Structure formats: structure tokens, C-alpha cells
């Protein structure tokens, strides 16, 4: 119904953004998976073995079978815990384009609406048309009956009768699209939408150029991403390093066995070297490592991360001048809507008073109704461009404010506060 | 050399299509790669040795040489039987996006084979153009020097013949690029080709929207892909609670070592326990291995599948929508070229009855050779434009029953009622 | 200063063409790690163990410790060899981009400089146009004040006014936008630029377009792209079969050992067996395998490598027909050029040949003032459709230029001797 109400629905309903939201959980559960190797571990290995003797060897005989846990814990590695600092680093990041995202949704939102009302105006002012055409055509059939004209008049009036009829029904396919492509984003059908209220529209002059510039360079998304993406370039700087420090582990563990033999050629001789024995193991111990001269395998590991960073602290400036760019031309086009709208208050106004002078003149008798229809489809012709021009306005304003890094829903409420009266999408 | 027929070439000439059969075909065989590691592997392990005791072991000479064989048999691990799953899932992804390159293809090739002719019309109506202008400048020049007209007039005339100049050299340059356009495509260069036989030309009416919609959502392409991505997100959370399953293997190994004992000490009051021996090995067994803890990896890995499922389900949602949307504009697409082209075929009707008018005006003498020129140039015009609508409303046609998803080659009829005489694309 | 000058300061100062020096020098770094897996890989160990495993043993004390080094040297793998020319090939592939790249930024270049020239002109004929209707708007209103005209025409010509008004203000506004985006490019802001000598230009004829071709075929930067592609597959071909050869490696070692047993039990007619021992050891050693059966795994590969091996060959002849296709594209924008010039100078001299009309009909009092500046308006806007057109020539040979490859400073160097006169641009 109105612009809040198509907004607050959309924020719940629309996939894009629910696919954001998942995939930011999805990151921030990685960081579990970084700590996980950090804690301990435990497993099993049971099993069964039987040898055999052969090529003279025949009369032996054995029978394996074990069963042991395993306890092993990490107690100094530097490796694992670059993995957790990247993992948050990529929380970060995740939470940034989320923020993107629902920026976007905003103006896409507003967009739609403004692309609605757009189409009902030109469908209006398309009938307008259409009548005024038509009542021409009416008049030439009219003057060749009479015998004041040819038949190429006719012609000429005909074509341009079935050009309307053309342009008319292709009105009405946008509007059904707009509608449509409305739905895509909230998920509805909407038979209704508040329109614009002329009486408190708003056209204030906007903030100096400096200082739109110094507080989007504070609160940017784009920019922000860059500056997370290097610090996890760094991070991955210092990620390499750690290649080639020592570390130490703990191992324990615990396990039986019986271990009988049998067999008729076994006996003989035996000399207690072949008698059945059951034994258990209880090693713990610590361990260590260091590598060298291992042709540099890490070593040439670390010049790539440091050309990685450089390259990534090139983008973070190519972003920065981005901004720069982005910023300056969106507020040039927010002085060219103001200009542009004066130009067709202008226009409307002059075409008002070509009417009423039509009017006038058929009113005491000097003018035909074509003149009258004629003169009603050029006005409806300038509201149309003078709506067109209001809503790029505003559309001008939201895209400022998201420039600017400060785009929210509460920034949008004061919108509402200029669409008041309720109009039919397809009216009967 | 109609459609049917540079098509059937481009089939089996089109690059596009032949890189996605061989991305099908590396799909399809991956399949038989992921089957091997469940068979049974053999391998082979001879080496050798070298020792020198000190220490305590000082004067300790030994030498060894090994060889055996080895063979392991997985007896229970779905890890396995999920990646065969996972990978046809894979391949019937591929095979999807193989259809719908099939469709592309040839709606690529239907658009440039139009794209031809349009240029050849829009050649005919320049040249016819230009006969015009320079029709004009003649006129002008010889009044100017007759007197009658100032020079402005004539240089007036020189300015307009020189851009008709230009426009004649554009289209030409256009003429040539479709036909590279379509050597581009097809794989060879077309002199002639076969243009619309007018006289029998269809303007259909499609069947209801909802129809085409109840089809859609049975047989598109992109939504079935989309299908297959969720069935293949729930197969690897499926994949991800695999971890905690136990496995056990079964191994099997043979080989000989005859080891030789040397030495001053050994010689002398050996004992019997440093006498060779000429024993072998035929090890067989089993071995069974399950996690306990394992830190929550696990624990882990299930939730991030789970989050990439609710992922993969929002993107579905998507696609249906896109889907819709789609369907709806190309149907409204259809009626908005129905319209167009009665009104243009009422424009030509117009038109032929002033180019009529001026003719007979000549040859009583109430007009001049150039109104008749410019005349034949309009009608041009409402010629070229007539050709192109005709020639949208078959591309749009085709857009639509390719929104269906159902056109691979049933446009046999469609276009072969729609030919005629062959039209070069080159003349000299 | 001047276009020599801008590209010299962009060559170094740009961030794009520096990212992709990084990324080469990423890539040839790239050729140390893979070379390292051929030299020694020494390395170091020590770990103690303590044990009473009692499954039998009750009251046995054994601790453990060891400390010793580790040597391996691979002799015969073909494993390596083959990541070793693979890197090389991807080096070569950076190399090509990098390439790209450079004539990337020439071309952006080029095109910001004309820009900024494109718009002082479009501002310096809206500022005419502005002054041309502002005198209409005052000889009209003095009309209706004198009492000749309705309140009507006040309004069309007000209308007017405002409507040139918007135009100046978008005119300025891209003049501004114009010189950030150049800004974004070299990173300084430029005063004042160099413009083009009109009466030092040249209008020369192209090559014949089989040279063009041929050379196109030479030193094409996408076909050696291409081409280096094809042979990584290849390789890559070659890389898969080498999984079946066998393997052969060498390792050392040595170290200590203590295994201090304790226990006043353990101690006394022992038999020496359980006594502490300080043993060390020198084991030195090669071994050797063959792989025998391994399923699919050996089989798939190759016929996966040659499904990857014909889709790069599909690609190669993809960039074959665009090649050509753009070549015949540029080649022909060059004449389309050239006549646009042709027929923009005949506009010229009609528009300087009617406002001399003008002007002289006016010094002998047959013209209003009015009339004078309508003409002055049209030569003046006669002026910038001429002056877009040779800078669309000049681009259109650095294209053409960078599609046969040869695009260098020396070919922009040609264009900086018609650039002579510097013009300011921000007026006043």
C-alpha cells in the first residue's frame, strides 16, 4: 500500500538478502572449524593380523591381535593461529557485503515504486492521445464524405490512428512488467500505490562537495572491504613465515594384546623363544622438529605473499579514487535534477495557458474540438514529464545517501511522509 | 541456402557447442575415476639398505634388501559411495547446461540469418535515397545558375548529397559485418540467401499465459538445473555426517628378504642367535580405525553444509521467480509485435497512395521528377520498416518458444513456408 | 601538459598496469617452489618417551629419548619436470596479459584526453545558444509589453530559457566529470590541455586489409594467448600419462638414543639384557615402487586430459574468427570515418555561408538582431560536430592499431604533432 509497508515486507521476504544472511553464518561458523585442530584428539586402531612361513620357513605361525587408543595434542604452532586470525578477517568481510546488500535492497525497492507510478502517468497520458487522434481521423472521414479532401488525407489520418493503437497497448505491457518485476523483489501484487502529494514537496540544497567527500571516506562500504582485504593480505604475509619455525606435539596412548601360538611343527627346540606372552604399552612422550636446507621451499613461499600484498594495497587505492569519482558525480546529478525540474514546472505552466486560451476561443466559437483535445493532450503530456523528473529526484537523493555509506530504513521514513493519495495500479 | 539449411552446417561446425560436448564428456568420464579407489591396488616395494652402528654398537657392519607387495581392499566406507553419487549429480548438471547451449545456438544463428536481410533492405531504401538527392542538387544548381536561387541554397544542397554519401558507405560497411556476423557463426561465407516469401506471411495468436507458464515450471532449463543444485546440496550435507562412521580395510601382503650376518664378532660362539635364515612372509589381515572426539570438526562441517542447503534453496526461489517474469514478457513481447505490425502495414498502405498521387501529377505536368523521387524514397522507407517488424515478431517467436524450453529443431515448418527466391548479400 | 606528457606521468602512476606487473612477478617467482621439490630436503628430530605399559610387566620403568636428522633426495620422477614447465608456460601467460594491459592503458588514455576537448566545445556552444534565446525572450516580452502578442509567447519563449539554462548546467557538470575521470587515471588534476591544430591535420587511406590479416596472424596478443594455452594442455596431456613410471628416492640419518631403564628389581642377576644401553646408529638407504593396478585412476586421467586437451582447441579457433572479425570491423570504422568527415566540413561551409547571409542583410537593416545570433549559434554548433569527428578518426586508428598488435608509445607519438595550442579547461 504504501512505500514503508512494500519495504518491510520485502526486507523478510526477499531471497538475495536471505542468501547474505546465510552465507554470513555460514563464515562466522568457519572460525569453530579454525579452533577445532587446536583441542585434542582421540581414536581407535583395533585390528587382526596372521603371518606365515614359507621356503623352509613352514611350522611358524602367529596371531596378531590389537586394540589401543590415541591421544594427541598440539602444544606450540604458530600456523594454527594465522588460521584463526584470517577466519576473522572473513567474518569481516562477510559482514561488509552484507551491508552492501541491504543497501542495494533499499534502492531497489524505491526504484520499483517509482517505476509503477511512472507508467500509470504515461498510460494516462497515452488515452489522452488516443481520443484526440481518434476525433481527427473522425473530422477527415467527415470532410471527404462532404467532398473537401482526398482519399491519400485519409490514409495519412489512418496510419496515424492505428500508430496510437500501437503505442497504447505497449503501455500496457510495461505497466503489467513493472508490476511484475515488483512482485520479483517483495513477492507480491500490489492493485494499489500512494502517489506523490505536490503541496509539500521537497527540494533542499545539498551539503558542499568537501564535506560529503571526507564523511564517505570515513563510512564506506567499498572502501572498507579494501582495507579488510589488505589486513588479510598481511596476515597472510605473516601466515607464510611460520613455515619455517619449530613446533612441538604430545602423544600418548594405551593398549593389550594376546598373543597364543599352536602348531605341531612349531615344537622342538623351542628354547622359550616360542612360547605364548601377553604384553601392553603405555608410551608418552613429546616431540619436536626444525627444518633446513630445504631448497628454499618456504623461503620462496614468502615473496609471493609479499607481491600479493602489494597488489592488493594497489586496489585498496584504485578503490580509494573510485570513491573519489562515484561521490563527485553523484552530487552533479543531483544539481541537474533540481535544474531540470524547474524546466518543466516552466513547461507545464506554459501549456496550461495554451489550453485555457483553446478553450476560450471554442467557448465564443473561433476554434473545432480538435484544437481543445490537442491542447489537453500536450499538458498531460508536461505532468507526465514533471512526475518523470520528481521521482529521479528523490531516486537522486537515495543514491547520494548511499554513496555516502549512510543508507537506512530510517532515512527512508521520511519519504513516506510525501506519497499520499492512493491510486490504482489497473484501474476499471 | 535458407535457414534450415545454414544451420544444419552449424551444428556440427559451432565451436561454442563442441567446447560444451567436451566439458559433458569430461563430466561423464570423472565418473569412472571416482569408482577406482573402491577396487582393490597393487604395487610394488623393493629397496635397499645400509647401516654402521656406533655408540655403544660400534664395529657393527650391516647391509639389507627387501621386496614385497602389497594389495588393500576397502570393505566399509560410504566416503566413497558419496563422492559416485555427488559426481552423476555433476553430470547431469552438465548435461543441462549442454541443452541449453544446444537452444542458444540455434537462436543465435536464426537472429544473424535476419540480421542479413534487414541490411539488404535498409541498402535498397539508402541508394534509392541518394538517387533522390541528387535529383535535388541538379535542380538547384541549374536554377542557380539560371539565377532564381542564391548560393546558400546550393551549398544547402551539397551538405544534404554528401551525408547520404556517408549513410550509403555505412550501410554497406553494415552489409558486410552481418555476413561476418554470420561467417562468424555458421563457418562459412553465404553469397546468396533466401528472404521472406510476403505473400504468405502467418500472424498467429499464442495460447493463454497460464499454459505457457504450467509448461514452464515442468520444463525449463534453468529451473531444472537449479533442482538438480539443491538435490546436490543435500547429498553433500549427507556427505558431511559421514565423518563420524567408522571404516576398516583389509590388506594382504607377500614378499621374501634373505638376510646374510657377517662379522669378527659374530663368528665364534654364535649360538645359534646370529645364524641366517632363508624365511619368508605372506602377512594377511584386517585393521578398524573410528573417532571419539576429534575436537567438534565434525560437529562443524554438518552446519556449514546445512547453512550452504538453506543457501542453494533461496537461489531456487529466485530462478522461479526470474522464470516467471520471463515468461510474462516474452508473451506480452508477441501481441506488442502483432500490433506494430498491423500499424505498420496500414503505414504502407498510405504511403503507396501519395507516391501513387505524384505520378499521375506527372505525367499530366502538374508536378516535377523530384516529388516522385521523394516519394519512392517514403515508400522505401515504409518497405524497410515493414521487413523488420515481420522479421521481429519471427525472432520474438522463437524467444518465446525458447522460454518454453521446447525448440530444438521442430522450426521446420515454421520458416520453411516462409521462404522464397534466393537475395544476394554481396552484389557488385 | 600535452598527450605525451599525460600518457609518460600515467605510465608509472597508474594502479591497473602496476597490479599486473605484480601479477607477473607473482607468476615467475612462481618457477623457485617448483623447482625446489629437486634439491635435498634435510631436516632435524627429538622426541623422549616414557613407558610402563603392565598388560603383563608389573613395575617396569623404561623411559626413551632419541635425537637424529633426516636426508631424502629424489633420483627419477618425472612428477617434477613436468610442474616445472607447466609454471613456465603459466609465466608466459602473465607476460601476454601484462601486455594487454599496457595497450589497455594507452587506450584509456587517449580516449579521457578527447574527452575533455569534446566538452569545452559542447560548453561553449550551449553559452552561444543561451545568449541567442535570452535576447528572444527580451525582444518577446517587450513585444507583448508594446502590445503585439499574447501572454502565450511570453511563456513558450520563458520556457525556452530555462530549458537552454538546464542544458549549460548539464554541459558544465560534464565538462567537471570529465576532468575527475582523467584524474582517475593518471592521479593529478590538469588546468589546461592541449588541442587539436586544425590546419595541420592528415587524412590518410588505410593499409590493404589482407596485410592487416596477415599481420593480425602474426601478433595478435589474444591468439598467442591461445596458443601458449593449447600447449599448457598439452603438457598437461603428457603430465597425466607420467603417473605410471616408477619412482626412485635416497634418505640418511642418524642419531642418539638413551633408553635408562630404573628399578632396585630390575637390577641383580638380570642376565644383561635389561641393562641401559647408549646405542646409536647410521642407517643410510634407497627405496624404490611401481605402481602395478590402481583402477580408473591411471585410465581416467588421460582421456579427461585430452577431453580438456580438444576443448582448448575449440577455444583457439573461437579467437581465430574474432580475430578476424575485429580486424574487418576496425577496418572498416576507418572509412566510415573519413566520409563522416567529409560530409561534417561541407555542413561547415554551408553554416558560415548562411550566417554571412545573415549578417550582411543585417548591416543594410533587412534583419532583426535576433536573426544575427541564430546563425552564429548554428556555425557555432557546426563546430562541434566537425571537431568529434577527427578525434573519432584518431581513436579509431589507435584501435585499429591495437588490433593488429603494433599498438606502442611510437604509433601514440604520431598523434601528439597535430596537438599544438593549449586551451584552458575551466573558463572563467
Avoid: C
Avoid at 476525433?135 to 496510437?164: E, K, M, P, S
Avoid at 580509494?320 to 505552466?349: D, E, G, L, M, P
Avoid at 528523490?394 to 510525501?418: F, H, V, Y
Amino acid at each position: 500500500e504504501n512505500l514503508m509497508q512494500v519495504y518491510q515486507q520485502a526486507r523478510l521476504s526477499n531471497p538475495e538478502l536471505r542468501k547474505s544472511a546465510a552465507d554470513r553464518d555460514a563464515a562466522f561458523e568457519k572460525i569453530n572449524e579454525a579452533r577445532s585442530p587446536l583441542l585434542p584428539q582421540l581414536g581407535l586402531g583395533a585390528d587382526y593380523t596372521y603371518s606365515n612361513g614359507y621356503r623352509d620357513a613352514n611350522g611358524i605361525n602367529s596371531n596378531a591381535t590389537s586394540a589401543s587408543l590415541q591421544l594427541t595434542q598440539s602444544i606450540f604452532d604458530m600456523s594454527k593461529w594465522r588460521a584463526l586470525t584470517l577466519q576473522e578477517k572473513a567474518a569481516g568481510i562477510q559482514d561488509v557485503t552484507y551491508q552492501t546488500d541491504q543497501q542495494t535492497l533499499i534502492l531497489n525497492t524505491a526504484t520499483a515504486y517509482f517505476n509503477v507510478l511512472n507508467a500509470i502517468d504515461v498510460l494516462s497520458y497515452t488515452q489522452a492521445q488516443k481520443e484526440a487522434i481518434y476525433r481527427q481521423l473522425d473530422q477527415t472521414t467527415q470532410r471527404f464524405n462532404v467532398g473537401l479532401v482526398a482519399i491519400t488525407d485519409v490514409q495519412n489520418a489512418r496510419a496515424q490512428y492505428d500508430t496510437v493503437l500501437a503505442n497504447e497497448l505497449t503501455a500496457r505491457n510495461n505497466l503489467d512488467n513493472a508490476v511484475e518485476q515488483l512482485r520479483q523483489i517483495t513477492g507480491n501484487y500490489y492493485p494499489e500505490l500512494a502517489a506523490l502529494n505536490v503541496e509539500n514537496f521537497k527540494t533542499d540544497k545539498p551539503q558542499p562537495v568537501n564535506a560529503l567527500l571526507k564523511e564517505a571516506e570515513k563510512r564506506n562500504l567499498s572502501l572498507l572491504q579494501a582495507r579488510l582485504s589488505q589486513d588479510l593480505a598481511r596476515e597472510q604475509i605473516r601466515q607464510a613465515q611460520d613455515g619455517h619455525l619449530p613446533t612441538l606435539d604430545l602423544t600418548a596412548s594405551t593398549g593389550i594384546s594376546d598373543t597364543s601360538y599352536s602348531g605341531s611343527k612349531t615344537r622342538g627346540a623351542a628354547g622359550t623363544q616360542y612360547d605364548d606372552s601377553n604384553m601392553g604399552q603405555n608410551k608418552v612422550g613429546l616431540s619436536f622438529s626444525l627444518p633446513i636446507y630445504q631448497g628454499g621451499m618456504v623461503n620462496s613461499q614468502v615473496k609471493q605473499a609479499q607481491y600479493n600484498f602489494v597488489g592488493a594495497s594497489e586496489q585498496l587505492e584504485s578503490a580509494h579514487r573510485s570513491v573519489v569519482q562515484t561521490v563527485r558525480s553523484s552530487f552533479n546529478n543531483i544539481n541537474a535534477s533540481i535544474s531540470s525540474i524547474n524546466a518543466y514546472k516552466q513547461a507545464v505552466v506554459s501549456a496550461q495557458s495554451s489550453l485555457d486560451a483553446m478553450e476560450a476561443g471554442y467557448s465564443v466559437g473561433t476554434r473545432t474540438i480538435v484544437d481543445v483535445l490537442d491542447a489537453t493532450t500536450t499538458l498531460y503530456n508536461a505532468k507526465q514529464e514533471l512526475a518523470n523528473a520528481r521521482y529521479n529526484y528523490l531516486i537522486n537523493q537515495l543514491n547520494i545517501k548511499s554513496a555516502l555509506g549512510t543508507l537506512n530504513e530510517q532515512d527512508l521514513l521520511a519519504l513516506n511522509n510525501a506519497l499520499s493519495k492512493p491510486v490504482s495500479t489497473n484501474p476499471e
